[PDB]
């Protein structure tokens, strides 16, 4: 077995990747349980993550491809 277009596909990394905030992009210390959104701190949480208008969480996760 050998292929060209599929054997040059890069395999997933063995080192665990760095976690980042979804809306700001710093360290996501916390992830909201209901929203599944990585967020940096409290004012980010209560200012963006709580009053977010529904359907925006999927396009949030679409950047990381978790939608």
Partner 1 sequence: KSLSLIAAHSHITGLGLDENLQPRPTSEGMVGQLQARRAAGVILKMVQNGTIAGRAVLVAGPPSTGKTALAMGVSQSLGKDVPFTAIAGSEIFSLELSKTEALTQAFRKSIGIKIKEETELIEGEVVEIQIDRSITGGHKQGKLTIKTTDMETIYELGNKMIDGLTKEKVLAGDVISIDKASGKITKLGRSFARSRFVQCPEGELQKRKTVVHTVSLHEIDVINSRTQGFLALFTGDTGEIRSEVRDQINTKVAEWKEEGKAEIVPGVLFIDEVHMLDIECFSFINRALEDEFAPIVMMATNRGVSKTRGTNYKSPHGLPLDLLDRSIIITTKSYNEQEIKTILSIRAQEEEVELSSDALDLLTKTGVETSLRYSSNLISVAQQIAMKRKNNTVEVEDVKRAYLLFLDSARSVKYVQENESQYIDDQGNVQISIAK
Binding site for partner 1 (CB under 8 A): 29-33, 41-42, 45-46
Q: Which residue has the tokens 């990747």?
A: 17
CB of 30 to partner 1, least distance (A): 4
- Nearest approach in angstroms of CB 52 to partner 1 is 14
**What contacts 52, CB < 8 A, 6 or more positions away?**
35, 37
Contacts 24+ apart (CB under 8 A), 35-41: 36/61, 36/66
| Least gap, CB of 13 to partner 1 (angstroms) | 18
Q: Which is nearer to partner 1, 46 or 67 (CB)?
A: 46
């Amino acid at each position: 077995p050998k292929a060209t277009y599929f054997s040059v596909e890069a395999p997933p990394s063995i080192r665990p990747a760095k976690k980042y905030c979804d809306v700001t992009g710093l360290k996501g210390f916390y992830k909201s349980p209901t929203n599944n959104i990585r967020y940096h701190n409290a004012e980010i949480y209560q200012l963006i993550v709580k009053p977010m208008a529904p359907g925006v969480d999927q396009e949030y996760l679409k950047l990381r491809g978790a939608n």
